């Protein structure tokens, strides 16, 4: 078939979306990437890494 | 963002110098609780009253009109009765009676 | 969310009478999009001084 | 070993309490048709037996000891078999109630309404028709669950008929959104609904559910919303003092009027008694007729339209 | 299984129950005086961990002995309801409605209490009645303090509800501020500038 | 009236609770949906 | 010229709207609104006597 999935908001030429007449901007988010992160601490009760 | 309690405040001034005369009635529950209600003078006194406790109380005055409360709406026995017959149930009772007989004494 | 709904209704609905029109529910997808663009800390009001 | 770990896991806290209820119901297994027949015969026999002792208790019999004792046994065993049947089909109640979660109510509430429907179903179960118990019981379970959902899931209680029409309107608009795609306009919803558009508007108004006063300030929950709602039902503190000043000034202007006729106006508009009373009562308290009262009213009323009385009173209106 | 097989074979010689009513029975059959004197004897003679446990208990036991409080009030039989104007239902501009979030908790408590009443009056099994009593307990627990036992009872949008404790507690609760600091009438504010001729 | 001097918190009992109250709420309803009256 | 003009900031109230559950004055300059005489000001006035 060809199913109507819904209206999708479209960014204008200026980099902004228009929701309910108002103008809104989706701010890029800095997150912590998934992966492996090997980290170390010290133990003052033992002085070992 | 206005709001209201669905009520109205009256800007009236207290008139304690004269009020309409008010009579006082004494109601009593079944468990010996007493309650005083300042009812209106030119008004009827309902002998059966819902009191401050929450249960139904009657007036200390002796009237007892007995409103003829309703029978229980429907019992399990009523529901079995309408879908079966008395002799069928008697046959089943006999069946269980002789069943426990044959279980016990053999 | 829509996939949970669709795989719920795959089983309960009779076979040899269905089509993706009858199976797909687009209300949760459009609800999710509308909930993202409105009332989210990242879909910020555009600041034009 | 493995069974030891099984017994250790058998005794856990399970702070969820729905998991606790599920581990509780896991104790009792299912039943098949012949034991359903046996249980039905036992419960019906016990109910007949308790009816017959109740009949024979009144004005009745010094019963034989063995007969007396053993239909006591029958009466207790009827309740035993009943209880057993309910324990057997509680898991069925859970299975039918599992699909109605996620909206309106909690889960265990729905479980309990299903259990009540199960008591009602075992009350009206007939075995002579030769049917599996689940087929008949599902009917009562679904009925009880939908009833308790209808009249116990809104802060403002909407009666069941309006809940049903609201649910039907919601389903119809949902299916039209999914199929027609174009958003259903209210009058077309009325056409499909076979009701008037104003009834549709009233239904759409009634369905609206209350928000909390402790949600977002405007966008986020920094401050409770109840800290930004004014109170129209409140003393505005200028109305009270203005109203008292109006009282004193109106009393003064009434005093500057004529004697007993200003007071007839005072009684007519009830400035001291609180109730107006009619020409019959004014005549009764004064010993006069009613046409004289109306003439007095008109004469006093004419003077207060004249500016000296009105100038110190006009600004209040 | 063990419990039922003791009770149906040794039904006399003892009484055993389950739930808050059993705790109420325990508080009924509890001499505060002799237990307090035993704790005094333990602190007088014993030592170590037993000492410290005796000290902590006596801080609660002697608290109930000195004043006139019966400890029966620890269990609850009648739950009071806050006046309506402290949990108002207002009609916002727009024909909407705003509950004060206590109405839902009270509705849950009343629903479960009425359902328990109907269950007991009708004649219901031990499992269903005990589950209903447990939910009554959990509803009262949620009413008095959300976020303590189990999970916070949530509302729409998966937002935790505000119980009675969450109105006394917190920085925004009554006890701290809205009681010490208040918005005031006859007031104003403005940006400021230097007034070197004043 | 003032003349406030002491505040005594304490464990309330059932006989105190059902003496505070003016009634016994027994229905889980708030407002009639159509007339907007309690 | 920054967007912190006086006309957006100047504010006064002798009497106005009132809050809902508590009967405190409202605030925020959107209504008349009043200034929060907070805890620290309470301490400052206690210290004066």
Swiss-Prot record, chain B:
Q: What is the lineage of its organism?
A: Bacteria, Bacillati, Actinomycetota, Actinomycetes, Mycobacteriales
What does the record give as the function of this protein?
Binds to RNA polymerase (RNAP), stimulating transcription from principal, but not alternative sigma factor promoters.
Name of the molecule in the record: RNA polymerase-binding protein RbpA
The protein's assembly and partners: Forms a complex with the RNAP catalytic core and with free principal sigma factors.
Q: Which gene encodes it?
A: rbpA
Q: Which InterPro entries match?
A: RbpA_sf (IPR038638), RNApol-bd_RbpA (IPR025182)
Swiss-Prot/TrEMBL keywords? Transcription, Transcription regulation
Q: Which domain of life is it from?
A: Bacteria
One annotated GO biological process: positive regulation of DNA-templated transcription
State if Secreted is listed as a keyword.
Answer: no
Which family does the similarity line name? Belongs to the RNA polymerase-binding protein RbpA family.
What GO MF annotations does this protein's record show?
bacterial-type RNA polymerase core enzyme binding
Swiss-Prot record, chain D:
Q: Does rRNA processing show up as a keyword for this record?
A: no
> Which GO cellular component does the record give, naming just one?
cytoplasm
Q: Where is this region: Sigma-70 factor domain-3?
A: 164-240
Region labeled Sigma-70 factor domain-2 — which residues?
85-155
| Gene Ontology MF annotations | DNA binding; sigma factor activity
The family annotation for this protein states:
Belongs to the sigma-70 factor family. RpoD/SigA subfamily.
- Chain's role: Sigma factors are initiation factors that promote the attachment of RNA polymerase to specific initiation sites and are then released. This sigma factor is the primary sigma factor during exponential growth.
Name assigned to this protein: RNA polymerase sigma factor SigA
Curated annotation (Swiss-Prot), chain F:
Q: Which residues form a coiled coil?
A: none
Q: What is the similarity comment for this entry? A: Belongs to the RNA polymerase beta' chain family.
Q: Give the multimer and partner information.
A: The RNAP catalytic core consists of 2 alpha, 1 beta, 1 beta' and 1 omega subunit. When a sigma factor is associated with the core the holoenzyme is formed, which can initiate transcription.
The function of this protein is: DNA-dependent RNA polymerase catalyzes the transcription of DNA into RNA using the four ribonucleoside triphosphates as substrates.
This protein's name: DNA-directed RNA polymerase subunit beta'
Swiss-Prot record, chain G:
Q: What does this protein do?
A: DNA-dependent RNA polymerase catalyzes the transcription of DNA into RNA using the four ribonucleoside triphosphates as substrates.
Under the subunit heading, UniProt states: The RNAP catalytic core consists of 2 alpha, 1 beta, 1 beta' and 1 omega subunit. When a sigma factor is associated with the core the holoenzyme is formed, which can initiate transcription.
Q: What is the lineage of its organism?
A: Bacteria, Bacillati, Actinomycetota, Actinomycetes, Mycobacteriales
Species, as recorded: Mycobacterium tuberculosis (strain ATCC 25177 / H37Ra)
User: In which domain of life is the source organism classified?
Assistant: Bacteria
Q: Which family does it belong to?
A: Belongs to the RNA polymerase beta chain family.
Q: What is this protein called?
A: DNA-directed RNA polymerase subunit beta
